[PDB]
Curated annotation (Swiss-Prot):
PROSITE patterns: GLYCOSYL_HYDROL_F22_1 (PS00128), GLYCOSYL_HYDROL_F22_2 (PS51348). Belongs to the glycosyl hydrolase 22 family. Transmembrane segments: none annotated. InterPro entries: Glyco_hydro_22, Glyco_hydro_22_CS, Glyco_hydro_22_lys, Lysozyme-like_dom_sf. This is Lysozyme C. GO terms for molecular function: beta-N-acetylglucosaminidase activity; identical protein binding; lysozyme activity. It is found in: Secreted. SMART domains: LYZ1. It catalyses: Hydrolysis of (1->4)-beta-linkages between N-acetylmuramic acid and N-acetyl-D-glucosamine residues in a peptidoglycan and between N-acetyl-D-glucosamine residues in chitodextrins. It comes from the Eukaryota. Residues 1-129 form the C-type lysozyme domain. The active site is at E35, D52.
């Protein structure tokens, strides 16, 4: 599923991401835009053989099991394919674990390089929340 901007913002707000660990909703929408272009089915292979999955491009090296990343962890205790669902619950719940691990949203390269330090509130402007 390819979300609309305000549609995704509302779904993330309902799942408790607004101000989670101090990160306002616009941060999460901005991250999703540049990680996946709002597409739950996005996948991208990393040079180490791991793969990033879903709207927030969660990496199989640490967070999910895809059966093809030897020596990796599954810290969210989920198959990586669950992160491609049109229902973003699994992605949101796993992202809550990632953001709590000590590095905040710097875990998402696109957030650090394209959202951090910008007017992220613009990403939820106009949305009925
Ligand atoms: Cl915001
Ligand atoms: Cl594996
Ligand atoms: Cl933080
Ligand atoms: Na894994």
């Amino acid at each position: 599923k390819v979300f609309g901007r305000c549609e995704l913002a509302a779904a993330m707000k309902r799942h408790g991401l607004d101000n989670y660990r101090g990160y306002s909703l616009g941060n999460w929408v901005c991250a999703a835009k540049f990680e996946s272009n709002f597409n739950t089915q996005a996948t991208n292979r990393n040079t180490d053989g791991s793969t990033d999955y879903g709207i927030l491009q969660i990496n199989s090296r640490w967070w999910c099991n895809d059966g093809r990343t030897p020596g990796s962890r599954n810290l969210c205790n989920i198959p990586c394919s669950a992160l491609l669902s049109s229902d973003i619950t699994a992605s949101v719940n796993c992202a809550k674990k990632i953001v709590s691990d000590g590095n905040g949203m710097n875990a998402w390269v696109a957030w650090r390089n394209r959202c951090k330090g910008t007017d992220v509130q613009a990403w939820i402007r106009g949305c009925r929340l």
